[PDB]
Design a protein around this ligand. Sequence first.
Ligand code: ATP
Ligand code: MG
Length: 297
Amino acid sequence: SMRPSLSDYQHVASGKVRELYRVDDEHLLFVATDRISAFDFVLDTPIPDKGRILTAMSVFFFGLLTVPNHLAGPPDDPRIPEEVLGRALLVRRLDMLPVECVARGYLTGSGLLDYQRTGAVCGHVLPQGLGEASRLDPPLFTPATKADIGEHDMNVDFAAVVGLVGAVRANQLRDETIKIYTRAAAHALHKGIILADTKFEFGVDIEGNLVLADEVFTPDSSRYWDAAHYQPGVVQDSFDKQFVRNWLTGPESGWDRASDTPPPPLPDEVAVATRERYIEAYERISGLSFSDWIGPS
Ligand SMILES: Nc1ncnc2c1ncn2[C@@H]1O[C@H](COP(=O)(O)OP(=O)(O)OP(=O)(O)O)[C@@H](O)[C@H]1O
Ligand SMILES: [Mg+2]
């Protein structure tokens, strides 16, 4: 249990709810936090154990899939500081590809909106008559690129991906994205949870291999829905975040989402209920017990 301090590692970067540290020239520490985002705001109130639960989830899916991934040691690797144990992974440093590899099995969000405006999504001209939460058969590769800080990603088509990473690599990204999405979506649905869409971040290792990195198939990287009352044609509830969304936009919060100003803190009971939803998604899909996952509660 002798472990380095987080302060022993250089802070490299990161986004809203995760952190990245340099361990050495070829390894990083990939840290999930308990912070949660809703309506594109990072909320004041952390969700207890969220970082650990989502790390456990990513680790499960990395083990399920047979494709190369960025894991470089066990979840209890001694290079991991105690203060992030269970919510941090020792990973291989990759050259990240500048494209968001999104797979959509169902039509919602910007995919639906692009379809309603144009009849197409990311260069895919779709059948007429689709709508909110329609199943996409087959699932779509719907790549995007990151835009300015704070604003939504830009949907692009396959030709744009070719110009970003090369023709052969673009085809490789497309094929792998669809393959692993299809497998994971079937696995989750078998247990009563729909993986509506998901985003992969790929990088390339020293050998030129395509490597799956960042987070995979978590509620932060994906839209999860409860299959039990999946109803094409209406907006589906977020499996994990609906209690948060309902409280924020309900009569008790005092917050108007349309104001586009930072939301107030959550009730502790809502945070704990949300924690339980994350655990439920993890346990149902993985078939493992979160009580066995490492790290402090
Ligand atoms: N194995 C890896 N090697 C190198 N960089 C990585 C690796 N895994 C993830 N990253 C990168 O680290 C950066 C920070 O990670 P983080 O998940 O916070 O980014 P993000 O997904 O863009 O965040 P957000 O979705 O909140 O905007 C990302 O640009 C991601 O591509
Ligand atoms: Mg982040």
